Amino acid sequence: DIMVPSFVYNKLPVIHFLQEKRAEQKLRRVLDETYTEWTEELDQAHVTDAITRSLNI
Amino acid sequence: MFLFFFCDLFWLRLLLCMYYCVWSRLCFIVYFNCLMLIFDFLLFCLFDLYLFVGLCLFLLLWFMLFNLYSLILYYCI
Numbered sequence: 173d174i175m176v177p178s179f180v181y182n183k184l185p186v187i188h189f190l191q192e193k194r195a196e197q198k199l200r201r202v203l204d205e206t207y208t209e210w211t212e213e214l215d216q217a218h219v220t221d222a223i224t225r226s227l228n229i
Numbered sequence: 230m231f232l233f234f235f236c237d238l239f240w241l242r243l244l245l246c247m248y249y250c251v252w253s254r255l256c257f258i259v260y261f262n263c264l265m266l267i268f269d270f271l272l273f274c275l276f277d278l279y280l281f282v283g284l285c286l287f288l289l290l291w292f293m294l295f296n297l298y299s300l301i302l303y304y305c306i
């Protein structure tokens with residue numbers, strides 16, 4: 173009735189703060205893993221050059 | 230021989246019931262050393278070294294309800 177409730181009450185703030193920090197850490201890790209991917213595709217100039225070779229020009 | 234008597238804490242028991250039906254933080258403890266046995270970090274004990282906390286707190290509460298209030302005249306320990 174008295175002791176355990178008082179100690180739980182004393183615990184509450186630190187746990188709340190630590191859990192808030194943990195959530196912010198999760199969000200930060202989520203953000204840090206985002207990178208914009210740039211893909212390289214075969215230049216069409218080579219395709220045009222090959223077309224010329226097929227044209228036998 | 231069996232003697233039937235009562236402790237002198239009935240009013241204090243009533244006050245405890247009245248004032249502690251709701252939770253309240255405790256920050257001042259007469260014997261605080263029972264909660265901090267290890268002062269150097271990375272030291273840990275496999276023995277149940279925190280088993281004495283509950284008994285310590287209850288004993289402090291009981292002995293304080295008796296001794297401190299015994300200063301009031303006619304109060305009985």
Ligand SMILES: CCCCCCCCCCCCCCCCCC(=O)OC[C@H](COP(=O)([O-])OCC(O)COP(=O)([O-])OC[C@@H](COC(=O)CCCCCCCCCCCCCCCCC)OC(=O)CCCCCCCCCCCCCCCCC)OC(=O)CCCCCCCCCCCCCCCCC
Pocket residue numbers: 231232233234235236242
């Ligand atoms: C022959 C004559 C009669 C006597 C017979 C005795 C037989 C003895 C057999 C042999 C025994 C040998 C060994 C003895 C060793 C003694 C050692 C000793 O005393 O050490 C001191 C030591 C002192 O302790 P303490 O620190 O004072 O704390 C104990 C307190 O009880 C307070 O501690 P606590 O607050 O932590 O306790 C918990 C408390 C938590 O708090 C509460 O619950 C609050 C209430 C507290 C009650 C207890 C305190 C009593 C206060 C004084 C008496 C109150 C008024 C009585 C009025 C009587 C009028 C005549 O809860 C309770 O007490 C639960 C009981 C609640 C009862 C509620 C009843 C409601 C009824 C409602 C009815 C409504 C009807 C409506 C109808 C409508 C119709 C239209 O005593 C003890 O530790 C207890 C000793 C008990 C030993 C067992 C004895 C055997 C059982 C006997 C029962 C007799 C019943 C019949 C009686 C009939 C009337 C005459």
